[PDB]
């Protein structure tokens, strides 16, 4: 998790 | 997978311009996406991508003057262009490395290119 | 738009053939336009495309034995297909990249195929 | 000439992968073909290769786990990946200098990337 | 104006 | 020949 370009 | 673009147009130089790149289909995970363009006669060469790292390169061309942000929900990814010259002129190409949800094998997707001129 | 693809069938090695294709519909610029062929079992192959500044590409198979030209007021192009071999046997694909008068999008356009057959 | 890689997947560490790297088209000789990594937000880097030597030569994290190897009749390599582990994980990358039949001049060739993945 | 393949 | 990764 942040945002999938990556959690 | 399909990708489509939006935005682009005709600005006088100084002017400004947004472009989009919309992703339809399932996505695992993102390993590059973002723009190339090609001005008539020349060779495509890439104006802003973001990689896997999540680190986001600019042409040397750029200097500043454009700004790469996204929405992963939307599966959006936008480029805000300001301080557009005559030399900017030309066909930007979304651009996709891309995970397809289940397959393991990467494969590249292009948008079918967006129309920019800057003049007077 | 539309494209309608006419000519293509079957000759010899030696022969000739000729392909012409037809746009319907209003059309501002020409970003690409030219064919594609797909033999059965393989890929698809780009063949002989114009780009924006003119320049007209030809794949490596081409040997100079196929030659492209255009019309821009029928809004046709023509593929003159000399000096054939059984290796070029493939289906033959028109194609574009055009903006839609409309907007400042570039859509893809194929037409349907045409058969070029050489043999005996 | 074009390169589709297959295998690669998921597993855990102690886990296998096999990749295919097949390659279309005309080929009269290899300069270089192998696999590079690369870790997210790092630098790609070589894996395994072989020159035309003949002499493969393996990156250090490569012990035996990595075992290179070709199919020449059918223009396919495969790197069989053996005891996997997290800290090695990347982008995998299919990688080719070759010559086709009707030219003296080299290309570069990648493939589009394989996820592995532990 | 050339000829829409580009003017 | 021998096996195009070395005639």
Chains 1, 5, 6 share one sequence.
Not at chain 2, 10 to 17: F, I, K, R
Not at chain 2, 70 to 87: C, G, H, P, V
Not at chain 2, 99 to 109: D, S
Request: glycine share 14%.
């Amino acid at each position: 998790x942040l945002x999938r370009x990556x959690a | 997978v399909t990708l489509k673009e939006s935005g682009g147009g005709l600005v006088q130089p100084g002017g400004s311009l947004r472009l989009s790149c919309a992703a339809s289909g399932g996505i695992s995970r993102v390993n590059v996406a973002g723009w190339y363009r090609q001005a008539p006669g020349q060779q495509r060469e890439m104006v802003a991508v973001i990689r896997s790292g999540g680190r986001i390169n600019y042409a040397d061309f750029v200097k500043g003057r454009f700004t790469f942000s996204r929405d992963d929900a939307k599966q959006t990814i936008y480029l805000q262009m300001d301080n557009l010259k005559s030399e900017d002129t030309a066909v930007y190409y979304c651009y996709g490395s891309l995970l397809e949800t289940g397959t393991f094998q990467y494969r590249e997707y292009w948008g079918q290119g967006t129309q920019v001129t800057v003049s007077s």
